[model samples]
Target: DSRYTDLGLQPLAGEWRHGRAGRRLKVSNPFDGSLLLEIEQADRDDLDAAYAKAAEVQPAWAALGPSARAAVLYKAVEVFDRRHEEIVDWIIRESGSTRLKAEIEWGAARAITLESASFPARVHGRIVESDVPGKESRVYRSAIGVVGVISPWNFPLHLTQRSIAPALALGNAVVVKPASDTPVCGGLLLARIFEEAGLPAGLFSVVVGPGSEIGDAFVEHPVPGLVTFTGSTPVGRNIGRIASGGAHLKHVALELGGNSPFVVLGDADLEQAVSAAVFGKFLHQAINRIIVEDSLYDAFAARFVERVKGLRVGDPQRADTAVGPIVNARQLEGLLEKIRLARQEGAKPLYEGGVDGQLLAPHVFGEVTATMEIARDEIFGPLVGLLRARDEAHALELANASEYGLSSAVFSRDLERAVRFARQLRAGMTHVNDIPGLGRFNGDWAIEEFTTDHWISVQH
Candidate 1:
């Protein structure tokens, strides 16, 4: 039996080749520093070809019946489910994520595909009675034609699939630009799966290259009706600015970075809070950060540090390993820099884990304040920063101090109080009586943040 037969795909050489250019960069596995794949850099010529191809086929894709689009997406999900294990392993090796992290990533992809495939049921119109008798107005949500999806390095597979699957299901052709770091595992694999699912060529295309150079090309090309980005806040801001200047006023969805707080009330359950924080901070190699409140600050900090210290950091292929190496050298450097800055800024270092070969032990910092760079910035690594708040009001103040308003959590035994506090928290999504990240694929507030039409939505 073939190794990839279970995945409904034939094992083929994964290369990055542009439409016109031959090859640009050689992709490597950051875990062991091994050459994993090569991707062709899309130069100006390649950009033109890609955009023209997407433009040529986008109208046809959009014209496809919604049920037909849903059927194709459902078939893609079936393919994904059959090859789930192999795909998870590929993500682990290529993205330097732990096995569990890989599982969650794949699960998120499957969930997104499953949920988005049924989008036709949700795309209904609202009928309003006009001021004049016997007159009515109907408003409908329509597809935005072609969409340009720029996914991030962390959670590469899930991020790309989530954006692309939804766009396709909504009758929009997607041109996906996977982050250069883990291109093959995310970008190429997605394209291959869609192809195997019998998707038309150019309806789903992967362009590999430096995002800094090629990203703007996708926006400036004017073929993409929407630009959906999942990455740093600064990059999202830049894209927003550029998209705003365009003649069409392009539609954009940005799921930017954040310094998420995991608040624990004095009466909160310690075990549940600790469990949530551990999974939130250390899992995905700390793609998400955690900020703790004053009530459970010391207890949460101590247990969190102990939990991370006890975690097994080893080869990602090993099922027992709870932690993996930082995704890349740049990520490693950034993590270490945040730790050093935290120490310099007078935050107490509770535990310091040495970098064992490629694997870095999870680090935890205590006595942290919102003013510190570690607390203020989105340190996308397994470094948890503990900050104290005098009370719920103070906690809310500190959590809202950052420029980010991504995902946050508040833990309290009193559901009423927790809900009230969560409502007041200045975040896009908040979890009560939980750690940082806890939700079903559809339940996640951040996921809605990515998919919703934010311009028209009002946030009270």
Candidate 2:
């Protein structure tokens, strides 16, 4: 860790220099409250310099051709594959990730990088005939200059890598403003990997600072043509406003808050539904509510609570730890307060989870209605709401009650029925009869988000 402290926010393409900002940020371990590392914060001037450098180098980086750009990412894949343990350890230490979550994050990062390696060659264009007497038209996809990524701490590695790798693979430069809680794994680590893997200097940079100080600058900067953010809806609303409303009017992509519902139909296998609910509701502790049909409500609740009670909550370093510490004391207190508020709202605490410092156990509440704050709000911690629905129709109604709709799941043995139900769910990503897995960015999804399209006509 001392080795990293010496760098002082200077991992911008292998160069070592202190930030212009006099302010400093000290990252601490959530489990034991021990200091992990201290680094200087990047100021507006530092961000400006980084963006200028990116713009200056971006054209040359793109001109190197798709094959050359992909070779760099392919080498990055090799580097990341070989050096997995250190990065995984960093995820655990810096971001308070369990060994399993950390490993999954690493694997997702690697997989996306490798998948993105094939992107440059797959940036296919279309040729078309023109109406003119002697003319031909072609529509092509190209990188949108510099991409500004505002990544969150939860699932930091891949969430950030998903935006970064594809943008870079398509010949764009990137500037990442990772969450202050996880600047190391989210921002600086990627800079280190790319720099070591032979990426040209100034094509990529990581600016570490609080959102209040650097967030607007990253979005409003003139160099970056697109800005992508993954975080809460409130914050994302502000980001969308700034990225689109201002004089610059940059393109924006938001992966915001989710009060996802895991629906259990009446005909669903009780044990299978419970199993999927446990993992779906608890992984990274994201899901906030579960909707169950009245037919299986009692049985499903009993089994789900039993499974939650048995989960181990402690230091993520231990192999047996199922739940890890919350990011910090503030997050833990907020989660506890939400639980208290839910109790006041008459929701029955099916399993009153314990607390040990920053490690809060999983808590499940029952008798939750769609109107309750616990059911309506996006609680990012390990708290879950159990709502009883009359039938599949009622379950779908309860599932779509939330304003946030990032992901949803339906559990039923009827594959076609589940698929039909999944289609009706108001979510970007949906799961049928299983837990949500790592999503891949293939084809035009990644290209559309990170690049701009152009149509050129040639006169013959």
Candidate 3:
């Protein structure tokens, strides 16, 4: 519609004129199934053009120097602030995100961009001691030419922005393939933000298409030096294999699935633990498995179930709604199937709630074991399993049992004990006595993710 057009919601932004993909893609609201926007899909030819244009303009973009590049990022953030409500609306409609969730995503997008603004000037290099006489050794940090990003639907805006902001700030051009379910918020929104920021053309592009086509094409393309993906492990594994197994190996980063464990020791404050556990479970659907010490297991389970039952599940647009609908019918079906599978594995839902189409009430399961499929797999739904641990050591063991280690949390009043226990959990990001924060999930480590160091030796 003209409203979308006014918002600069075009399928191809930086490289629009070069697009050859003629397929029409429709974006609809998950809550009401209303047509939000319609745009063209990117084909193989468009993907090629995206990379070619990136290669052509990357050096120039990089040559603009740290201050100029940083200025563009600052402007993008400013534009985001200007259109904050509009972007939040799109996120809420497309991703089925509650207003609170959408606001958190907005804050994340802003924080990451501000953090990335420092990357251009902070690309530090090192001077090393020479192994041979009259020779100098130096390592210089530079951009990776082009970065390929494949973001997920769960947290579309920031998840996409997390990679794109860093890559562009560090002098690398980018081509992003956002999840098809959230193409507008995840892909086109960023394109508009950058265009409004006056970022040079061809430096960034968003391609909306099926994973089978653009996803593989992104990894197989030779222009990008590194490819980053945030999605399921199965899909991430395939992308990794294709990225690495090709004749020209590419550096790939995967933020795959997680069965994050929220461990609550006996000494932990039951009220705080229950609150944190509920928020973690419903917030981006984290902490799928809650591991509690045997001493307070039954009490914590009862309180958690009762608190979750109170969360309002309905239209996200409602100010009182705490839980929103799933992104789509397929995701809702998958969540139901997982709940069914959990029951089959001997786990019983303590507080079973009814489902209203895409809106699924939160579920809390009891009698969960470490080996159960529900506890072991990463179920990105509003269902959590309560597992009893013999002791703190058993809790730690249970938390670390999953192959996926994305994020984990520990709750205990004894700071030292909580820190000690939290340190043992095998996850990328860990929290103690709190839910996960908005930004800084990976900290300064992201700078290195988008950087490539070159070692050079000169004879003196």
For model 2, residues 1-460, the per-residue Cα lDDT tens digits are: 2222343456453255767678889988888888888888878888888888888889998888788988988999997877788889889998898998888888888988888888888887789987798899989877889888888877788899888988998999998888888888876888878877899988888888666877787888888888888888787999988887778988788878878888889889888888778776665534678888998999999999999988888889877888888887767888999999999999998998778888888989999999999988888778999999998888888999886787888888899999999998888888787743135367568877777779999998
Regions of candidate 2 where Cα sits further than 4 Å from its true position: 1-7, 12-14, 284-286, 435-440
Number of clashing pairs per prediction, in order: 4, 0, 0
Q: Give the TM-score of candidate 1.
A: 0.87
Order of candidates by TM-score, top first? 2, 3, 1
Candidate 3 lowest-lDDT run of ten: 1-10
Evaluate all candidate structures by whole-model CA lDDT and list the values in order.
Answer: 0.72, 0.83, 0.82
Tell me the spans in candidate 3 whose CA falls farther than 4 Å from its real position: 1-13, 17-19, 283-285, 435-443
Cand. 2 TM to true fold: 0.95
Most accurate candidate by TM-score: 2
Query: Residue 343 CA error for candidate 3 (Å)?
Result: 1.5
Q: Candidate 3 versus the native: TM-score?
A: 0.94
Please give, for residues 56-122, the per-residue lDDT of candidate 3 as tens digits: 8899888887999999989988988888888888889989999988988898889888878877777
Q: Can you write out model 1's per-residue Cα lDDT over 1-460, one digit (the tens) per residue?
A: 2334222121121222344444457767767889765555665566666667777777787677878878887898898888888788789878888887788888878878888777755564456556666555665555666678887887888888877887777767777777778776656788777877878877766776666667677776778766888878777889898888767677788878877777777788888988887877776423244555565677777777778888888888887888888787877887777778888899888888888756778777777777888878887766777777788778778877875777887788899998998888788788776444234344233224323332232222
lDDT of predicted model 3 = 0.82
The runs of at least 3 residues in candidate 1 whose Cα sits more than 4 Å from the true structure, single-residue gaps closed, are 1-18, 125-141, 245-248, 284-295, 435-460
